[PDB]
Design a binder for this molecule. Structure first.
Ligand SMILES: CCCCCCCC/C=C\CCCCCCCC(=O)O[C@H](COC(=O)CCCCCCCCCCCCCCC)COP(=O)(O)OCCN
Ligand SMILES: CCCC[N@@+]1(CCCCCN2CCCC[C@H]2C(=O)Nc2c(C)cccc2C)CCCC[C@H]1C(=O)Nc1c(C)cccc1C
Lengths: 615, 73
């Protein structure tokens, strides 16, 4: 029992007598008398943790002691039992402690190289301490930056680990390697490095195995997983991965065609990129929820930006302009129909003159467009199935078009219920309608960035300013109404006085609007305090804060606009009819080279011509 | 040890406004095992690339008198 205590001091004396005692009892090191009741802690494990200088002398001796009990193959493969570490193996502890010699020693004695370290501690879970690495010694060696140990575990003699073995969540080594990255400098450096290393190793060991297309339980390739979770560095490396080794040349993802003088034609592989496929990187990035960081930045990496711009310039620009024009005519007709409404009696109204026929046609088309936008909003709410937070924090334009449609439908309901209030609803639907044309500013770079900044101000600065301004306005309005005696425009009401004090903010206020108090000095002091606080201080401070915000969101605005255009391009391509949507697949089909087995490697590649002046 | 103001070196560094000394003292970590008990920031387990750390809260939390938080505030 106190064998752990002896090993903690690395004392080999007591184990010599322990061997004789075991031979006397004919017992084994794996018996329950030598395991912690709640953790299943074995002597080999305790020896492995309580290392000194990376090497403990009692480990080999315990190995022979087990062997004369015929327990070498069973003691080494002993694992924890407690749910927190359930699945941890002494090989794992060897890996994380970074002991090459001890790893070789354990693998010699029949240690399993496929032990699923799948306890509670080794699962990706927010809020609690832990470290997710893929539940395998191969994956743990990969995620802890031991290139030598992984090379050994792949190319040893006793037992070689499986490169394509998946864990509980179904991650290969590449999926765990992606999921460990966190978009810093050195982390990205070593993650990309060892990703490349494992690709070459897999190409050597299994030349006929396309390691990078294995999918986890969600059916996400490592590329798509990197795109989804927001690992920008890994994505940047993968999309531009170029390998010069002739044996691993087929594994490259960015080739060249010709290099006449200083100009090259670099081909990029569009497999799993262009939206013709499933879970394509473009679709994954564009439709990603706002929780995923770097969502705006991920469009900056080659060849994504060039690919989107090519799609736009080639067949989406025209469709977007046509949509803009159709919406313009829709709002023009809606405005002319609402403007010329009859102003007598109760709805519905009779059809008397030819102008009545035209106005009825306009009303019909307006309601039809409102219904169309209503159904489109429903379809968006179904297909995305966004969460409530994503619904009210991210869309902001599907929501607005949907809201306009809601107002249109309320208008028609009120109209056929013989209510005058329909006008109310309609005018709201009219105002929103026009103020939704800012949506189409997406199609133009300068105006699109401008509209993105408008959004950013409304959300950052205007909200805070409005809260403080409302507090001040309400406080001083209550004070003034209290001071004002009988109003007999009788500003002895809270509404009228709030309006009067609001006039000050728009540069139209009157300092002597009532004359109907008992203390002129108090009234003047209150109004001067209000003017100083809101008109002079708050409004100018708002201008200053907008200036600072403009200064700080110069690049975020451009990124957000580019992402908005990306979403528009993707939606347009998906919705466009099939008679030509296939006729405009992006890229060209080119024979890059030869597969490792030897055959024409036709790929859908996107060509970019560049120039370099180091030759 | 306290001076005639009953004002400990950590408390004095906090009150007088010496920030570099305070930053040192509150994250004082000593490698020497013979005097390792002096330190105030203790690593607790370092599995792989993650570390749990314990920061001593003695004479920092408000439960004492002349605590660092109260003196700064
Ligand atoms: C970016 C989005 C911008 C949207 C901006 C919307 C802001 C509008 C918010 C509240 C104002 C809406 C309606 C307020 C008052 C209209 C109803 C009304 O007039 O009833 C009034 C009372 O009804 C009420 O509930 C109002 C109670 C007064 C306290 C509310 C103060 C609002 C006054 C509006 C001006 C204040 C501007 C503040 C905004 C920055 C009585 O006046 P009367 O009808 O003319 O005479 C009958 C006696
Ligand atoms: C609130 C900003 C939305 C920004 N937004 C939509 C633009 C629509 C134009 C509407 N106007 C804009 C300017 C004035 C306000 C508003 C308006 O009508 N007010 C208003 C009302 C409420 C009642 C009565 C009268 C009026 C005038 C910009 C384009 C994209 C959609 C979305 C966006 O930014 N979405 C996104 C995100 C967040 C993050 C990442 C990615 C994306 C796509």
């Amino acid at each position: 029992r106190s064998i752990f205590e002896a090993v903690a001091q690395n004392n080999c004396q007591d184990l010599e007598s322990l061997l004789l005692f075991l031979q006397k009892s004919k017992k084994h090191l794996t018996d329950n008398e030598f395991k912690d009741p709640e953790t299943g802690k074995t002597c080999l494990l305790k020896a492995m943790l309580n290392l000194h200088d990376g090497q403990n002398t009692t480990i080999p001796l315990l190995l022979e002691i087990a062997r004369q009990t015929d327990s070498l193959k069973e003691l080494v493969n002993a694992s924890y039992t407690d749910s927190y570490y359930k699945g941890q193996t002494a090989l794992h502890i060897a890996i994380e402690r970074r002991n090459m010699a001890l790893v070789t020693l354990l693998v010699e004695n029949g240690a399993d190289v496929q032990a699923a370290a799948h306890g509670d501690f080794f699962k990706k879970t927010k809020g609690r301490p832990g470290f997710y690495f893929g539940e395998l010694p191969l994956s743990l060696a990969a995620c802890t930056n031991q290139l030598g140990i992984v090379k050994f575990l792949l190319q040893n003699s006793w037992q070689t680990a499986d490169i394509s073995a998946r864990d509980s969540v179904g991650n290969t080594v590449l999926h765990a390697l992606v999921e460990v990255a966190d978009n810093t400098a050195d982390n990205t450096k070593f993650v990309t490095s060892m990703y490349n290393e494992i690709l070459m190793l897999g190409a050597k060991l299994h030349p006929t195995l396309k390691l990078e297309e294995l999918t986890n339980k969600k059916g996400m390739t490592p590329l798509a997983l990197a795109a989804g979770t927001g690992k920008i560095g890994v994505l940047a490396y993968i999309l531009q991965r170029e390998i010069q080794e002739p044996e691993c040349r087929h594994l490259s993802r960015k080739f060249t065609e010709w290099a006449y003088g200083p100009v090259h034609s670099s081909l990029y592989d569009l497999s799993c990129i262009d939206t013709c496929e499933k879970n394509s990187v473009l679709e994954v990035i564009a439709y990603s929820s706002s929780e995923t960081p770097n969502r705006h930045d991920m469009l900056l990496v080659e060849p994504l930006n060039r690919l989107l711009q090519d799609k736009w310039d080639r067949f989406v620009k025209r469709i977007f302009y046509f949509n803009f024009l159709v919406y313009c005519l829709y709002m023009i007709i809606f405005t002319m129909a609402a403007y010329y409404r009859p102003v007598d009696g109760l709805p519905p109204f009779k059809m008397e003159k030819t102008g009545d026929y035209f106005r009825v046609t306009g009303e019909i088309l307006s309601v039809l467009g409102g219904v169309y936008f209503f159904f489109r909003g429903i379809q968006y709410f179904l297909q995305r199935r966004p969460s409530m937070k994503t619904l009210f924090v991210d869309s902001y334009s599907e929501m607005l078009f949907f809201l306009q449609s809601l107002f249109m439908l309320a208008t028609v309901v009120l109209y056929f219920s013989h209510l005058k209030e329909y006008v109310a609803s309609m005018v709201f639907s009219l105002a929103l309608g026009w103020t939704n044309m800012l949506y189409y500013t997406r199609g133009f770079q300068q105006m699109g960035i401008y509209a993105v900044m408008i959004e950013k101000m409304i959300l950052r600065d205007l909200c805070r300013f409005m809260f403080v301004y409302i507090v001040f306005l309400f406080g001083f309005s209550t004070a003034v109404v209290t001071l004002i005696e009988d109003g007999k425009s009788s500003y002895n009401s809270l509404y009228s006085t709030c309006l009067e004090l609001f006039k000050f903010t728009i540069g139209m206020g009157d300092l002597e609007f009532t004359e109907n108090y008992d203390f002129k000095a108090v009234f003047i002091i209150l109004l001067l305090a209000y003017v100083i606080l809101t008109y002079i201080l708050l409004l100018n401070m708002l201008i200053a804060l907008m200036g600072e915000t403009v200064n700080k969101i110069a690049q975020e605005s451009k990124n957000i606009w580019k992402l908005q255009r990306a979403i528009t391009i993707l939606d347009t391509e998906k919705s466009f009819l099939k008679c030509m949507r296939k006729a405009f697949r992006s890229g060209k089909l080119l024979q890059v080279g030869y597969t490792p087995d030897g055959k024409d490697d036709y790929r859908w590649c996107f060509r970019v011509d560049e120039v370099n002046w180091t030759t």
